[PDB]
A = this chain, B = another copy of it.
Amino acid sequence: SLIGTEVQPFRAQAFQSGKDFFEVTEADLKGKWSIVVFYPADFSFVCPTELEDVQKEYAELKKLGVEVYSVSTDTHFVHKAWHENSPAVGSIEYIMIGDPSQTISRQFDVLNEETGLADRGTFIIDPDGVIQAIEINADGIGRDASTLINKVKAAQYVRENPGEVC
């Protein structure tokens, strides 16, 4: 499992409510507690529930010094389109990376080779670029965005309190 491994090098276009398109690299994921969530496709049939539940928790997550990135094999262009032409996804303030080359979906071992889409997986990365938590559910079973603040806290506690885990 990628648990405990370090994020591999990548470069991709992203969109964020506010700033116009900008590049992103393995670097941005280093130096801060980043949490990236993957999802099938933009403009999909399934309701963007997962994505916005995260938006709600975003306010708080930022306080904990955490950054949030959503990823799908769609182009950053459609991410913007989706963001505008939809109230739900329009409330998202965090970063939306586009992975049309499939490279970053593939590196997190979450790309479904035959559909060309990513799986519902969420990763939590420590300031060192190391994966500390992995959650991948099948289409239908939802990811509870609330349990995130707990995990990142727990992750951060153990970060400067080794062995004190009981």
Give the interface segment out of A24-32, A57-65, A151-159: A151-159
Q: Is the CB of B117 within 8 A of A140?
A: no
Interface membership of A67, Cβ < 8 A: no
Residues of B within 8 A of A101 (CB): 113-116
Look across to chain B and name the residue whose beta carbon is closest to the beta carbon of A126.
Answer: B138
Q: Is there contact, CB below 8 Å, between A42 and B140?
A: no
By a CB distance below 8 angstroms, the chain B residues around A85 are 81, 85
Q: A75-B74, A100-B117, A116-B100 are in contact. Are A133 and B144 (CB under 8 A)?
A: no
Interface: A90 (CB within 8 A): no
Say whether B137 contacts A41, CB under 8 Å.
Answer: no
**Least distance between A47 CB and chain B CB atoms (Å):** 4
Residues of B within 8 A of A154 (CB): 140-142
Contact between A43 and B137 (Cβ–Cβ < 8 Å)? no
B165 and A139 form a contact (CB under 8 A)? yes
Task: Produce 1/0 per residue, A49-91, CB < 8 A to B.
Answer: 1000000000000000000000001110110111001000000
Chain A residues near B (Cβ < 8 Å)? 1, 3-4, 41-47, 49, 73-75, 77-78, 80-82, 85, 99-103, 109-110, 112-117, 119-121, 124, 131-142, 144, 147, 150-151, 154-155, 157-158, 162-163, 165-166
21 contacts between A and B (CB under 8 A): A1-B121, A3-B121, A3-B137, A41-B77, A42-B75, A43-B81, A44-B75, A45-B77, A45-B166, A49-B166, A73-B116, A74-B78, A78-B78, A85-B85, A100-B117, A102-B116, A133-B136, A134-B134, A141-B151, A142-B151, A142-B165
